């Protein structure tokens, strides 16, 4: 680890390591259902400086970068004295939802998502995630005043061990005031019966995993007095930069996340692991199956030992369990005359040449029998002794014994006296 | 030997035996160069009853069975009070030879050939034999008055050990008187430097061997006084039955000689021997090579032991000598999974099933390996132990050991704890 490498310890040998925690939103462009712009639109702010509840109406023009509120302002530079704010059309209302989506383009373990509003917080909204890259969409958290009516939800009920992957519906962070600067923040891991036990809880690891994330504002609040109608008065969504705090899901096997040949984000997978999330593991590491890392056991994939005599290999769960969870990895395409599980013994008509280690290419000489002197071409595949005929000693059977005279006739090449 | 069998002794086991000694001429038709017949011919006899040297001339007519002298009379019923006589034309003279031939149609060891004449004996003649059935002809004995002139022969010279197969030329049995009843008789084995040692002398065994036999009368005697010319006076050949005493050559391996499927004479070969003369030996008796019989060692051919697992086999002279003259006979087409010289051990991918004797058909079980449990299909071919993989005991490798747990995965079917 002669630079930063947290993945390998000071022995040299591997442990567990995580990519750095980030705002995965900054610089990354957000898709929206409703920007005011075309047409240029009325909007009003009711502002209580002093104690005076004053109405100030303005011009929402996406053609003018001084009056424009594009989705760019959701992931620009945050600076709360100088709030840059995306803004929607007015009184898009229940049933009609404004949605926003952010695609990460990579599985992230989500810690939180925060939305800072320069408008009132929604009366009713919901957050959604995608496990796949935007195909199915999965509920995450609901924020309705009337859960039973709106989302067919119990209001602030139980999370059990059976359904820890459960969105609660909660009349909270759904207050009208603050009229400006209100926070939505959802944290994934609150309220789970293994909240503590995240390294060791797979159901929670899946919960927080997501590729794309989607916010849905489903209703607004109307203040409910006689004003004089103003049209669509001041009822719109607007947010002054967003954050999605998360870590790049590499299952504890990778150092940092990097841009690809294909200009996609992937894990720089370290521990003989493979794929985008390091969620399978590398070819010819199929001795011992895939598992997520922890500090306890780094749990990583390890090479099939085929002795330099094979390149393709596969796992066997059966052999893994009957090896006592040590090894299930068996070799195919056995080269250099080798055979059996680990390409470990010489195939028939070769015997093991012990003068040479197994990793040596000629680890296995041919039986090399004298065809006349041998009663068989296949030798015993470890002793290398070809079976000789009546008194034809020698490994290759290339020689008469003492007491046996040589002939030239090949059916009877040695004979007694 | 529940009938005559001299070939097998009272143990049951074989010794040496010979066919009976015969006149091989009787009943068998003789080929000739000169019969008087057509035309009917003059012939005279000069006969000294009392003391009177009287000339009696007669009529030689093959159309009249009372005056006919056909070659039939060379091998008819002998009865010297009643002489039946074949007769030639008169004064066929040097250079002109009358020849006779007798084909036996079977190799015979000749003892003697006797010709009894009712005429004077030839001044000059010769006997010939055929080793092959009448192709080459080989000289045998010469009977000239002037050997040097007639046959380019020394008169009564030496027989050496280098040329025991040598016809002598001998002015003997070449006397004019007897004018009637004279004998030619040639005995083969006279005068040989291993005359005694016939069972043990191969060069003499070849000498006396013959298939066809040929007599050649090359000159006559003329009495040389002034008579009154008589024409062709009385100068002809005539013989009153012939004999060829011999034994049917079966090289001491056969009981008697018998007529074939093809109506040819052959040896009834007994001692696992084969051919006409028993002069090779039978298929699948090529352990230990062919040899003639004697009383000393019957020397006979003996079966290749291929253990009921082969039918074709061959000899090896090299293996015979290095077996110490015991066995040179090796097996081909090894059935029932057997292998090696005598089809004696199990071929690769079978091992020897000792529960069963070698002559049993299933003397050799398949390795019969458990294909999953074995690291090899070929077992050690006597132990029958297929090479099992990591802790898969058993001969067929059909079982995990104690301390090894069974899997269903075929690359790792047993595993420790
Ligand atoms: C939050 O607001 C979102 C916007 O909607 C507004 O507010 C709501 C309350 C209503 O008053 C509505 O009228 C307003 O406009 C709202 O999202 C919308 O939700 C509806 C219902 O879930 C979606 O409708 C369905 O659309 C699909 C097709 O559209 C999709 O695919 C096409 C491509 O083919 C895409 O281009 C679209 O973008 C979509 O992705 C229909 O197939 C489906 O039909 C169903 O209903 C009909 C009868 O109407 C039946 O006969 C059928 O069998 C089906 O059952 C729906 O019509 C709508 O797509 C979605 N719009 C947008 C723009 O995302 C969200 O639901 C609001 N939340 C709540 C809780 O109200
Ligand atoms: C015992 O008498 C036998 C009969 O002969 C009579 O007496 C002799 C002395 C002469 O006076 C003769 O003229 C009398 O008729 C005698 O047998 C004969 O021997 C001769 C010489 O060895 C044989 O001659 C050779 O014949 C072959 C071909 O004939 C053979 O094959 C045919 C088939 O193609 C058959 O049908 C025949 O039956 C034969 O089997 C010739 O190729 C060969 O030619 C050679 O000589 C010429 C010149 O003349 C050369 O140019 C060549 O290059 C050759 O060298 C011979 O002519 C004859 O076949 C044979 N006849 C019979 C009926 O068997 C025997 O030799 C007398 N014994 C002694 C010691 O005199
Ligand atoms: C919403 O946001 C938009 C900003 O994008 C505001 O638009 C401005 O509106 C004023 C209205 O008076 C525009 O001013 C007038 O434009 C007339 C036409 O000018 C056009 O073409 C010239 C070039 O040929 C451009 O430079 C100009 O931008 C326009 O596109 C002029 O006839 C007027 O002239 C008078 O004032 C000028 C001041 O420079 C004097 O020089 C002249 O002599 C004369 O007295 C006048 O300029 C202004 O152009 C718009 N600005 C921009 C940045 O687009 C909307 O007004 C705003 N509010 C609402 C309620 O919608
Ligand atoms: C090449 O091929 C040959 C044969 O084809 C193999 O050799 C045979 O090897 C086995 C085991 O290697 C020999 O014997 C058997 O050993 C069993 C285990 O004990 C051994 O190992 C333990 C430690 O693990 C030692 O403490 C112990 O001393 C042994 O060395 C025994 O359980 C067996 O005994 C049983 O059978 C015998 C008869 O065989 C009975 O009499 C007993 O009562 C008991 O029931 C057994 O002794 C075996 O004998 C070898 N063969 C021959 C012919 O002698 C090579 O090992 C093989 N190698 C390869 C890799 O291919
Ligand atoms: C050599 O050997 C042959 C033997 O094969 C002798 O041949 C005999 O020769 C005599 C000569 O006189 C033959 O006899 C005469 O044959 C004449 C013709 O007959 C032929 O046809 C009849 C049937 O039609 C046959 O049966 C017969 O065999 C002949 O083929 C006759 O005209 C003669 O007839 C006279 O005698 C007979 C005897 O029976 C009387 O009945 C008649 O009336 C008449 O008087 C006479 O028969 C004789 O046939 C031959 N015999 C045989 C067995 O063939 C040679 O003679 C002998 N010698 C010499 C020197 O060559
Ligand atoms: C199946 O396959 C296995 C192995 O593939 C064979 O088993 C091996 O068999 C050999 C011989 O059968 C074992 O050992 C060697 O034996 C030599 C001969 O001695 C044996 O036989 C004589 C009688 O003929 C006995 O008196 C004697 O006690 C032995 O039983 C020794 O000369 C060898 O010793 C030499 O090598 C050793 C090291 O191996 C040295 O330390 C010595 O100094 C010396 O130089 C040797 O001991 C051999 O060990 C077996 N294998 C294993 C792994 O143990 C089966 O026989 C075979 N069968 C068939 C038919 O296929
Ligand atoms: C930001 O600061 C400037 C002075 O530098 C001030 O004129 C401006 O009105 C401020 N903007 C907001 C939106 O508070
Ligand atoms: C044979 O015997 C008979 C009498 O039975 C006699 O007439 C005949 O002449 C004899 N033949 C010879 C050739 O001696
Ligand atoms: Ca901002
Ligand atoms: Ca006669
Ligand atoms: Cl290589
Ligand atoms: Cl069979």
UniProtKB/Swiss-Prot annotation, chains A, B:
Disulfide bonds: 85-118, 248-257, 250-267, 269-278, 281-301, 304-313, 306-331, 334-343, 346-364, 367-379, 369-386, 388-397, 400-414
Annotated glycosylation sites: 61, 82, 97, 380
Record function comment: Netrins control guidance of CNS commissural axons and peripheral motor axons. Promotes neurite outgrowth from commissural axons but acts as a chemorepellent for trochlear motor axons. These effects are mediated by distinct receptors.
Span of domain Laminin EGF-like: 248-303, 304-366, 367-416
The gene coding this protein: NTN1
Subcellular location field: Secreted; Cytoplasm
Protein name: Netrin-1
Domain named Laminin N-terminal: residues: 13-247
Top-level taxon: Eukaryota
Species of provenance: Gallus gallus (Chicken)
Keywords, comma-separated and alphabetical: Cytoplasm, Disulfide bond, Glycoprotein, Laminin EGF-like domain, Repeat, Secreted, Signal
One Gene Ontology cellular component: glutamatergic synapse
């Amino acid at each position: 680890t002669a630079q930063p490498d947290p993945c390998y310890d000071e022995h040299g040998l591997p442990r567990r390591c995580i990519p750095d925690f980030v705002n995965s939103a900054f610089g990354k462009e957000v898709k929206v259902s409703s920007t005011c712009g075309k047409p240029p639109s009325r909007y009003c702010v009711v502002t209580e400086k002093g104690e005076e509840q004053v109405r100030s109406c303005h011009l929402c023009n996406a053609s003018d970068p001084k009056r424009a509120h594009p989705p760019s302002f959701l992931t620009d530079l945050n600076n709360p004295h100088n709030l840059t704010c995306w803004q929607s059309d007015s009184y898009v209302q229940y049933p009609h939802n404004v949605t926003l989506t952010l695609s990460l383009g990579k599985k992230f373990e989500v810690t939180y998502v925060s939305l800072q509003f320069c408008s009132p917080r929604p009366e009713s909204m919901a957050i959604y995630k995608s496990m796949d890259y935007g195909k199915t969409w999965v509920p995450f958290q609901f924020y309705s005043t009337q859960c039973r009516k709106m989302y067919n939800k119990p209001s602030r009920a139980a999370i059990t061990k059976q359904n820890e992957q459960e969105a609660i519906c909660t009349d909270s962070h759904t207050d009208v005031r603050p009229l400006s600067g209100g926070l939505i923040a959802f944290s994934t891991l609150d309220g789970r019966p293994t909240a503590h036990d995240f390294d060791n809880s797979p159901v929670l690891q899946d919960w927080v995993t997501a590729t794309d994330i989607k916010v849905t504002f489903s209703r607004l609040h109307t203040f409910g007095d006689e004003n004089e109608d103003d049209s669509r008065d001041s009822y719109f969504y607007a947010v002054s930069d967003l954050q999605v705090g998360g870590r790049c899901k590499c299952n504890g096997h990778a150092s940092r996340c990097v841009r690809d040949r294909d200009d996609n984000l992937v894990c720089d997978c370290k521990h003989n692991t493979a794929g985008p999330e390091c969620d399978r593991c590398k070819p010819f590491h199929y001795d011992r199956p895939w598992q997520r890392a922890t500090a306890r056991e780094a749990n990583e994939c390890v090479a099939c030992n085929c002795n330099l005599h094979a390149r393709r290999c596969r796992f066997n769960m059966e052999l893994y369990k009957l090896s006592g969870r040590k090894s299930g990895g068996v070799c195919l395409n056995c080269r250099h005359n080798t055979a059996g599980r680990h390409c470990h013994y010489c195939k028939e008509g070769f015997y093991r040449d012990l003068s040479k280690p197994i990793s040596h290419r000629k680890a296995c000489k041919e039986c090399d029998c004298h065809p006349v002197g041998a009663a068989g071409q296949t030798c015993n595949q470890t002793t290398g002794q070809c079976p000789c005929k009546d008194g034809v000693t020698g490994i290759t059977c290339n020689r008469c014994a003492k007491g046996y005279q040589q002939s030239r006739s090949p059916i009877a090449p040695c004979i007694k006296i």
